[PDB]
Amino acid sequence: GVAEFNDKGELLLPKNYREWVMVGTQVTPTEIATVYVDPESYAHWKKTGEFRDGTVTVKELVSVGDRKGYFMGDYIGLEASVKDSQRFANEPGNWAFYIFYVPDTPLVAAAKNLPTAECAACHKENAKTDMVFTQFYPVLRAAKATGESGVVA
Is residue 129 a contact residue for ligand HEC (CB under 6 A)?
no
What's the burial of 53, exposed, middle or buried (CB within 10 Å: 0-12/13-18/19+)? middle
Query: Does 56 sit near ligand HEC (CB under 6 A)?
Result: no
Burial 60-73 (b: 16+ CB within 10 A, else e): bbbebeeeeeeeee
Q: Which is nearer to ligand HEC, 46 or 100 (CB)?
A: 100
Q: Tell which positions 89-108 bind ligand HEC, by CB under 6 A.
A: 97-99
Candidate list 17, 21, 133, 143; residue touching ligand HEC; CB under 6 A:
133
Tell me how far apart the alpha carbons of residues 119 and 105 are, in angstroms, rounded to a whole number: 18
Residues that bind ligand HEC (CB under 6 A): 26, 33, 35, 57, 59, 79-81, 97-99, 114, 118-119, 122-123, 127, 132-133, 136
